[PDB]
A paper describes a structure:
The [name] ([name]‐[name]‐2) as causative agent of the disease expresses a surface spike glycoprotein (spike), which consists of two subunits S1 and S2 (Wrapp et al, 2020b; Zhu et al, 2020). For viral infection, the receptor‐binding domain ([name]), located within S1 interacts with the angiotensin‐converting enzyme 2 (ACE2) expressed on human epithelial cells of the respiratory tract (Tai et al, 2020; Wrapp et al, 2020b; Yan et al, 2020). Promising alternatives to conventional antibodies (IgGs) are single‐domain antibodies (nanobodies, Nbs) derived from the heavy‐chain antibodies of camelids. To obtain a deeper insight into the binding mode of the most potent inhibitory Nbs, we analyzed the crystal structures of NM1226 and [name] in complex with [name].
For the [name]:[name] complex, we determined the structure at a resolution of 2.9 Å. In accordance with our HDX‐MS analysis, [name] binds a distinct three‐dimensional epitope located at the opposite site of [name]. Major contacts were formed by residues of the CDR3 (PNM123095, RNM123098, TNM1230100a, ENM1230100c, RNM1230100d, KNM1230100e, DNM1230101, VNM1230102, WNM1230103). In contrast to NM1226, also residues located in the framework regions (FR) including FR1 (QNM12301), FR2 (NNM123035, YNM123037, QNM123039, GNM123042, KNM123043, ANM123044, LNM123045 and LNM123047, and ANM123049), and FR3 (ENM123060) are involved in binding. Consequently, specific binding of [name] is achieved by a combination of the CDR3 and residues of the framework regions as previously observed for other Nbs (Kirchhofer et al, 2010). On the [name] site, [name] interacts with YRBD351 and the large loop region ranging from aa 437–503. The [name]:[name] interface is mainly formed by polar contacts and one salt‐bridge (RNM123098 to ERBD484), but also π‐π stackings (WNM1230103 to F490RBD, RNM1230100d to YRBD489) are present. Closer inspection of the binding site showed that [name] partially overlaps with the ACE2‐binding interface and that the neutralizing effect can be isolated to a limited set of residues within the [name] (KRBD417, YRBD449, FRBD456, YRBD489, QRBD493, SRBD494). However, [name] does not only block binding to ACE2 via its interaction with the [name] on the same protomer (clash I), but also impairs ACE2 binding through steric collision on the neighboring [name] (clash II). In accordance with our structural epitope analysis, the reduced affinity is most likely due to the loss of the charged interaction between RNM123098 to ERBD484.
Numbering used by the authors:
A (entry chain AAA): 323 to 504, 507 to 526
B (entry chain CCC): 1 to 125
């Protein structure tokens, strides 16, 4: 069986700017657990049909995961705008996959504030499809150079998420998982289409 | 100006000890919490230790949980990080952090340090 539990039921997720990517291949893809789950707030697919994922076979499945705010989950989609889908995590216009997310306020919120999760709100260029920037170089907002020193119109690109105990789901932490699917032997398959690879001792 | 000028660090041998210091100015240092991050070459900034406004509240993460101790001197407007039993994996740029300090600058409310290089390398052959 595919290792979805390793990425979905992980102890600690990464920041949106430093999104962790897993490679799911050569295994049975049980999408039943993903279907019959009332925990999942968002479950939207692009260029495919959620209801019929067991009726499909792909040669690679890149399972990207990270934490963002609830009001920023709408940005996680093809051809969008805003700090997240521009500086942190952008998808291609012709994207093929799904976007999963659930309110993780019970295990990513802290009384004093969870300062493990950050996000980049400053960038000279726009993040290319599936591009990742973990760099921490001083951003130039003004006309004059910074010279790697923080000052006027020159500041740190990263900003911490509050994630303090609040009542507003919009400003609460959400665990997002982007299952990006990919003329080659179809490795990750349904439980029926499985090309006798279920007994490979995955 | 809202600033955090961190000092200390340098080169030590495996098992060695070091203390980093972060001095704060241009804001009430005792009014905001202090966090210690570290960035290893190639990896993303990870949280090491976090402390409270001026209280006895210290939170450590898995990375260095055991061989690190966070503390602050609000009288001297400074926060320290006592690192002992250092390993070669600890070789990284350690940064201080005070969240939600800046005001009237948009979502950019955090104030970040410059960075202190710490290198835990063994002797030469
Ligand atoms: C863990 O397993 C799967 C994830 O692939 C899903 O049912 C859910 O996120 C978790 N379920 C339980 C019972 O922990």
């Amino acid at each position: 069986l595919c290792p979805f539990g390793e990425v979905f039921n992980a102890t600690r997720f990464a920041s949106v700017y430093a999104w962790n990517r897993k490679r799911i291949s050569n295994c049975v893809a049980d999408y039943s657990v993903l279907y019959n789950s009332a925990s999942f707030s968002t479950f939207k697919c692009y260029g495919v049909s959620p209801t019929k994922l067991n009726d499909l076979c792909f040669t690679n499945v890149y399972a990207d995961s990270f934490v963002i705010r609830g009001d920023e989950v709408r940005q996680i989609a093809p051809g969008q705008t805003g700090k997240i889908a521009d500086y942190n995590y952008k998808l291609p216009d012709d994207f093929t996959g799904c976007v999963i997310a659930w309110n993780s306020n019970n295990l990513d919120s802290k009384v004093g504030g969870n300062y493990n999760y950050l996000y980049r709100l400053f960038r000279k260029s726009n993040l290319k499809p599936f591009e990742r920037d973990i760099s921490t170089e001083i951003y130039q907002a003004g006309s004059t150079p910074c010279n790697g020193v923080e000052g006027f119109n020159c500041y740190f690109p990263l900003q911490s998420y509050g994630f303090q105990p609040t009542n507003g789901v919009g400003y609460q932490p959400y665990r997002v998982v982007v299952l990006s699917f990919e003329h080659a032997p179809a490795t990750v398959c349904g439980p029926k289409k499985s090309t006798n690879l279920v007994k490979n001792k995955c | 100006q809202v600033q955090l000028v961190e000092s200390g660090g340098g080169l030590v041998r495996p098992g060695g000890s070091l203390r980093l210091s972060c001095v704060g100015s241009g804001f009430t240092f005792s009014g905001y919490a202090m966090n210690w991050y570290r960035q290893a070459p190639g990896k993303a900034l990870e949280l090491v230790a976090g402390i409270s406004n001026a209280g006895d509240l210290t939170h450590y993460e898995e990375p260095m949980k055991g061989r690190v101790a966070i503390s602050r001197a609000n009288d001297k407007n400074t926060v320290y990080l006592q690192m002992d039993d250092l390993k070669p994996e600890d070789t990284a740029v350690y940064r201080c952090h005070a969240p939600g300090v800046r005001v009237g600058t948009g979502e950019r409310k955090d104030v970040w340090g410059q960075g202190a290089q710490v290198t835990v390398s063994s002797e030469q052959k």
